[PDB]
Amino acid sequence: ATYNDLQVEYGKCQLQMKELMKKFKEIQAQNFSLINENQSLKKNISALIKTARVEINRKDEEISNLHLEHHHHHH
Amino acid sequence: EATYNDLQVEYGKCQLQMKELMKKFKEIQAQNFSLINENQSLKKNISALIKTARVEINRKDEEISNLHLE
């Protein structure tokens, strides 16, 4: 009777857990890619933050000391 | 096979595990939307920072050259 309906629902519920579990493993794998890429992108920035500051600082000094040359020369 | 009661019990368990699992899924999926956007933020920051550091290095280099020359 309605027993069979219940057995159908029960079996139906189980297969949706299986499917939700495939989907879960999928996203899970995606997240590991993103975590790995994000952490590397962040290291890239910091390395670029450093190097940019070093170069710009290196440019600022030579510009400054040139203004000291031109002044000293025409003074 | 098994009594009508046993099916009822197992269906009961099955719907509890399911609600539980459905909770872990939506949140890892939320975590998937956040990481993706963050990832896109990082790529845009690395884009702009290169752009900004690139434009400054040149202009400071045009300065120093222009000064050395004249």
Author numbering:
A (entry chain A): 71 to 145
B (entry chain B): 70 to 139
Question: How do the authors describe this structure?
Answer:
FLASH, Flice-associated huge protein, was originally discovered as a protein involved in Fas-mediated apoptosis and later in regulation of expression of several genes, including oncogenes. Subsequent studies showed that FLASH localizes to Histone Locus Bodies in the nucleus, suggesting a role in expression of histone genes, and that it is essential for histone pre-mRNA processing. Biochemical studies revealed that the interacting N-terminal regions of Lsm11 and FLASH form a docking platform that recruits the HCC to the U7 snRNP. Our crystallographic studies of FLASH NTD demonstrate that residues 71–137 adopt a continuous and stable α-helical fold and mediate the formation of a coiled-coil dimer between two FLASH molecules.
We determined a structure of the wild-type human FLASH NTD at 2.6 Å resolution using X-ray crystallography. The initial phases were obtained by the single anomalous dispersion (SAD) method using crystals of selenomethionyl FLASH NTD. However, only residues 71 to 137 were observed in this structure, even though the expression construct contained residues 51–137. The length of the coiled-coil FLASH NTD dimer is approximately 100 Å, excluding the C-terminal hexahistidine tag observed for one of the protomers. Other hydrophobic interactions are formed by bulky residues such as Tyr73, Tyr80, and Phe94, as well as Met87 (selenomethionine in this structure). We also observed that Cys83 is situated in the dimer interface with the thiol side chains from the two protomers positioned near one another. While the electron density did not provide conclusive evidence for the existence of a disulfide bond, and the two sulfur atoms are separated by 3.4 Å distance in the current model, the structure raises the possibility that the observed FLASH NTD dimer might be mediated by a disulfide connection, which is unlikely to occur in the reducing environment in the nucleoplasm, the site of 3’-end processing.
